[PDB]
Amino acid sequence: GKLTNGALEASNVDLSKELVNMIVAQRNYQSNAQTIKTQDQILNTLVNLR
Amino acid sequence: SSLINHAMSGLNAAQAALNTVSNNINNYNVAGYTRQTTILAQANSTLGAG
Q1: Which of these, A19, A50, A43, A3, lies nearest to B46 by C-alpha position?
Q2: Which of A25, A28, B17, B47 is most buried by a 10 A CB count?
Q3: Which chain A residues contact residue B5 at CB under 8 A?
Q4: Distance of alpha carbon A37 from alpha carbon A45, whole angstroms
Q5: Considering only alpha carbons, which residue of chain A is nearest residue B9?
Q6: Closest CA of chain B from A20, distance in Å
């Protein structure tokens, strides 16, 4: 393609995308953390088996 | 972002036009001075956005 003189390219971040992608990432993180809490539940139940 | 860029670049154009009209109307009576007009145009609109 052509070039511009006296104009520049805006970095391709519409901040909204990454902000809501942050809430989503925090979401998956928290869900997986809850699953780890369930892992501890299971394993301490194994502790309780004794 | 791009919406604010739109807001501002139009502000730039409006300021330039005001400057031009003030320039002319002030210079109005000088012998040898010709009326002058300021023109607008669109950016290097090129596509990667879908």
Answers
A1: A3
A2: B17
A3: 10
A4: 12
A5: A7
A6: 16
Structure resolution in Å?
2.9
Q: What is the DSSP string of chain B?
A: -HHHHHHHHHHHHHHHHHHHHHHHHHTTT-TTPPP---------------
3-state secondary structure A14-26: CHHHHHHHHHHHH
Q: How far apart are CA B6 and CA B47, in angstroms?
A: 16
Q: What share of chain A is helix, strand, coil (3-state, %, to 5)?
A: 70, 0, 30
CB-based contact A10 B43, cutoff 8 Å: no
Would you say how long chain A is, in residues? 50
Among B18, B23, B47, B48, CA closest to B35: B23
Size of interface A-B (CB pairs under 8 A): 13
The token pair that represents B35 in the structure block: 């009326």
